């Protein structure tokens, strides 16, 4: 189902006004652009619209956590419009707002081929439906409707290329009421790879799940147990498993008291569905949860001593993970297996990444989830050595958990 939605390439844009939700949430300081990866990513869609004779391309986006209070001093899209101007090679009109009669007059009938960028959408509480020196404060249904009609007035067709926000029922996500709502090329990529993963995956299908807590991932694991042939359970999660399944001593490591109660239920579902579960067997320990702490080594047989904590897996665990990855024809990896921000505890994640790169090289379908694992793909420069790297963490997680995305659902079928 995720595949049969309308995309930009199947849309007719010649002579129409295109209003397009992009992902320009580039988090950098001094109002100078240090990493414009997302801007470069959103370029092919704008260029398609321009090179197919569109009258205008209007771009709405967000940046920061302002919670619906105008913060133009600190979180303004202005420098982006400069960056974009270079990457497009074309003038881009920056407007000081994204709604109202002035913006509506600006976008009513612009010159042929104009590119316009609106001010941050999250200056308004009506985008997210709730916000905040004003503390937490809400929105008003009539005002949300007015905001949505104002965005709807800005173009003849709508394009959504903001996958990372597609799990939020926000006004820019579901409140543009135009006859055709298409998905941009980033959207098309995401929906293709994840519909293949969730609907008809190559087999054997492997899921690699890491994280710090078991309780928030239950449904994830649960849904992943209806899909896959193998599961690797790594990261801080695993100790909660090992303390419960094998009575392992874990030292000062993360323990999920709630998730400890459902560990055996998940193993029971895995046994009922015939899923092979791979947990770590050795560990790199630390004296404290710090970057420059003393290190050590432990095994499931030895246990972790008191006062120390496990922050990464060891070489034998890497061998077992590589066994699992070697058997796989499709892989989905969400969440690293160690504290990769700190070089002393990034060895397991790096080794698993190398194994996934080789698997890709010999024909595996390797999808990397948003969040920290995409950050790993960027930190070791391997985005071009895997099949797919998702652009959104929460959205991809909610797709994996089996949920329907409000922004995706709001696209036109056929």
Is 61 labeled as ligand-binding?
yes
Is 164 labeled as ligand-binding?
no
| Helical packing angle, 218-227 and 263-273, nearest 10° | 10
Q: Of these residues, 234, 371, 392, 407, which one is catalytic?
A: 371
Is 234 labeled as ligand-binding?
no
Measured in degrees and rounded to the nearest 5, phi and psi for residue 114 equal -70, 145
Are 22 and 162 in contact by the 8 Å Cβ rule? The answer is yes
Active site residue 38: yes
Is 38 labeled as ligand-binding?
yes
Side-chain half-sphere CA neighbours of 60 within 13 A: 31
Is 62 labeled as ligand-binding?
yes
Is 243 labeled as ligand-binding?
no
Reported for 246-250, long-range contacts at CB under 8 A and 24+ positions apart, including other chains, are 246/300, 248/300, 248/303, 248/304, 249/303, 249/304, 249/305, 250/303, 250/304, 250/309, 250/310
Please name the fold of domain 193-280+314-400: Rossmann fold (3.40.50)
- The number of residues making up the chain comes to 414
Q: What is the CA radius of gyration of the chain?
A: 23
Tokens of 22: 């992009």
Q: Measure the CA–CA gap between 253 and 240, rounded to whole angstroms.
A: 9
Is 69 labeled as ligand-binding?
no
Measured in degrees and rounded to the nearest 5, phi and psi for residue 164 equal -65, -15
CATH architecture of 8-186: 3-Layer(aba) Sandwich (3.40)
Instruction: Kindly list the domain boundaries of the chain, sorted by start residue.
Output: 8-186, 193-280+314-400
- Equal CATH topology for 8-186 and 193-280+314-400: yes
The b/e string for 264-287 (b: 16+ C-beta within 10 A; e otherwise) is: eebeeebeeeebebbbbbbbbbbe
Q: Which residues contact 139 (CB under 8 A, 6 or more apart)?
A: 68, 125, 126, 128, 129, 130, 131
Is 384 labeled as ligand-binding?
no
Active site residue 393: no
**Helix residue spans in 36-140 (DSSP H):** 37-41, 43-51, 78-88, 101-106, 125-128
Q: Of these residues, 213, 276, 320, 385, which one is catalytic?
A: 213
Q: Of these residues, 21, 38, 188, 243, which one is catalytic?
A: 38
Breaks (C-N over 2.5 A) in the chain follow: 132
Q: Which residues contact 334 (CB under 8 A, 6 or more apart)?
A: 207, 208, 209, 210, 220, 369, 371, 373, 396, 397, 400
Is 212 labeled as ligand-binding?
yes
Q: Measure the CA–CA gap between 107 and 181, rounded to whole angstroms.
A: 18
Is 392 labeled as ligand-binding?
no
Is 48 labeled as ligand-binding?
no
Is 310 labeled as ligand-binding?
yes
Q: 195: burial class by Cβ within 10 Å (0-12, 13-18, 19+)?
A: middle
Torsion sign, CA atoms 350, 352, 353, 354: positive
């Amino acid at each position: 189902s995720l595949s049969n939605k309308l995309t930009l390439d199947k849309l007719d844009v010649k002579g129409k006004r295109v209003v397009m939700r992009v992902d320009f949430n580039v988090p950098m300081k001094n109002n100078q652009i240090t990493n414009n990866q997302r801007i470069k990513a959103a370029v092919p869609s704008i260029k398609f619209c321009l090179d197919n004779g569109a009258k205008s391309v209007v771009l709405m986006s967000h940046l920061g956590r302002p919670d619906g209070v105008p913060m133009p001093d600190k979180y303004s899209l202005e420098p982006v419009a400069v960056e974009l101007k270079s990457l497009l090679g074309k003038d881009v009109l920056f407007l000081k707002d994204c709604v109202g009669p002035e913006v509506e007059k600006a976008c009513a009938n612009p010159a042929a081929g104009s590119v316009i960028l609106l001010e941050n959408l999250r200056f308004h509480v009506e985008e997210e439906g709730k916000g905040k020196s004003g503390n937490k404060v809400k929105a008003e249904p009539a005002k949300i409707e007015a905001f949505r009609a104002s965005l709807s007035k800005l173009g003849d067709v709508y394009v959504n290329d903001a996958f990372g926000t597609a799990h939020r029922a926000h006004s820019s996500m579901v409140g543009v009421n135009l006859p055709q709502k298409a998905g941009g090329f980033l959207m098309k990529k995401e929906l293709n790879y994840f519909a293949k993963a969730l609907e008809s995956p190559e087999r054997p299908f492997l899921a690699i799940l890491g994280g710090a807590k078991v309780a928030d991932k239950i449904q994830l694991i649960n849904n992943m147990l209806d899909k896959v042939n193998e599961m690797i359970i790594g990261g801080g999660m695993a100790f909660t498993f090992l303390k419960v399944l094998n009575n392992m001593e874990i030292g000062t490591s993360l323990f999920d008291e709630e998730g400890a109660k459902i560990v055996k239920d998940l193993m029971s579902k895995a046994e009922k569905n015939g899923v092979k579960i791979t947990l770590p067997v050795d560990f790199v320990t630390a004296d404290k949860f710090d970057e420059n702490a003393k290190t050590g080594q432990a095994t499931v047989a030895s246990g972790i001593p008191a006062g120390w904590m496990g922050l990464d897996c060891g070489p034998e665990s890497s061998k077992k993970y590589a066994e699992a990855v070697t058997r796989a024809k499709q892989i989905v990896w969400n969440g690293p297996v160690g504290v990769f921000e700190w070089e002393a505890f990034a060895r397991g994640t790096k080794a698993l990444m190398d194994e996934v790169v080789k698997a890709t090289s010999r024909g595996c379908i390797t999808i990397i989830g948003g969040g920290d694992t995409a950050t790993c793909c960027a930190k070791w420069n391997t985005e071009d050595k895997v099949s797919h790297v998702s652009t959104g963490g929460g959205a991809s997680l909610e797709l994996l958990e089996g949920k329907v995305l409000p922004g995706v659902d709001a696209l036109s079928n056929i």
